[PDB]
Ligand binder design. Structure first.
Ligand SMILES: C[S@@+](CC[C@H](N)C(=O)[O-])C[C@H]1O[C@@H](n2cnc3c(N)ncnc32)[C@H](O)[C@@H]1O
Length: 223
């Protein structure tokens, strides 16, 4: 049922006008950066142990990196993002832990050699009206992340899954869970206009069931 229900949600979402979309997207949603709040939520729930060498793949402005850099078990943060035309570039600030981060823009992380890391973070996935476009980008991220997880036996991880209801993606996630453990969670701070979920090392759950539960929740909210 998962692809059917998420696909229904997507087609219904795309039928909303500007006013309906704006009202729908915040309905019952919890709530400085959105990025910070989401990683903080996952961290406080025990979704991911932030420790040692943290990689932040697709760091954009870098909220996750600054979050990670302020945590007691983190030793360094290596942050990477495209930062090319019309893509977010890291925003340097003077907050606690800033000196632990190395930001590198102008890097396509899908083409980077994995290296040593104790925690793998990745928040790549831009919403697109076409669910199949989102599935393809999601698959690409998961394939890249699998190489990192293979290279770093036992590392912690927290990975955005932009479209988790697509059948190919579900099978990909089950395979990652079979290989690396972990589970798939919905952050209640996510807006109703995205079906994004997070593949995390700290929580071990029923992936397909959680996805379906999120589809049914987001559909009910649109009713
Ligand atoms: C919007 S950030 C997610 C938010 C971020 N965690 C934060 O807290 O600010 C996702 C970033 O991934 C970047 N990105 C997308 N594809 C990429 C790729 N192939 N290689 C490197 N960065 C990529 C995008 O430019 C985008 O800025």
């Amino acid at each position: 049922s998962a692809p059917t229900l998420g696909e229904i949600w997507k087609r219904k979402l795309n039928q909303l006008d500007a006013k309906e979309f704006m009202a729908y997207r915040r309905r019952f949603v919890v709530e400085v950066s959105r990025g910070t709040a989401k990683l903080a939520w996952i961290d406080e729930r025990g979704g991911v142990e932030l420790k040692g060498t943290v990689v932040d793949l697709g760091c954009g402005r870098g909220s996750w990196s600054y979050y990670a850099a302020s945590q007691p078990n983190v030793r360094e943060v290596k942050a990477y993002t495209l930062g090319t035309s019309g893509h977010e570039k890291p925003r340097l600030v003077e907050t606690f832990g800033w000196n632990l981060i190395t930001f590198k823009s102008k890097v396509d992380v899908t083409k980077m050699e994995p290296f040593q890391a104790d925690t793998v973070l990745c928040d790549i996935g831009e919403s697109n009206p076409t669910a199949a476009v989102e599935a393809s980008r999601t698959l690409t991220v998961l394939n890249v992340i699998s190489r990192w997880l293979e290279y770093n036996q036992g590392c912690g991880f927290c990975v955005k899954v932009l479209n988790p209801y697509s059948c190919d993606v579900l099978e990909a996630l089950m395979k990652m869970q079979a290989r690396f453990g972990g589970g798939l969670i919905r952050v209640p701070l996510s807006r109703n206009s995205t079906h994004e979920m997070y593949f995390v090392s700290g929580i071990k759950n029923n992936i397909m069931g959680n996805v379906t539960a999120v589809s049914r929740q987001l559909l009910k909210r649109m009713e």
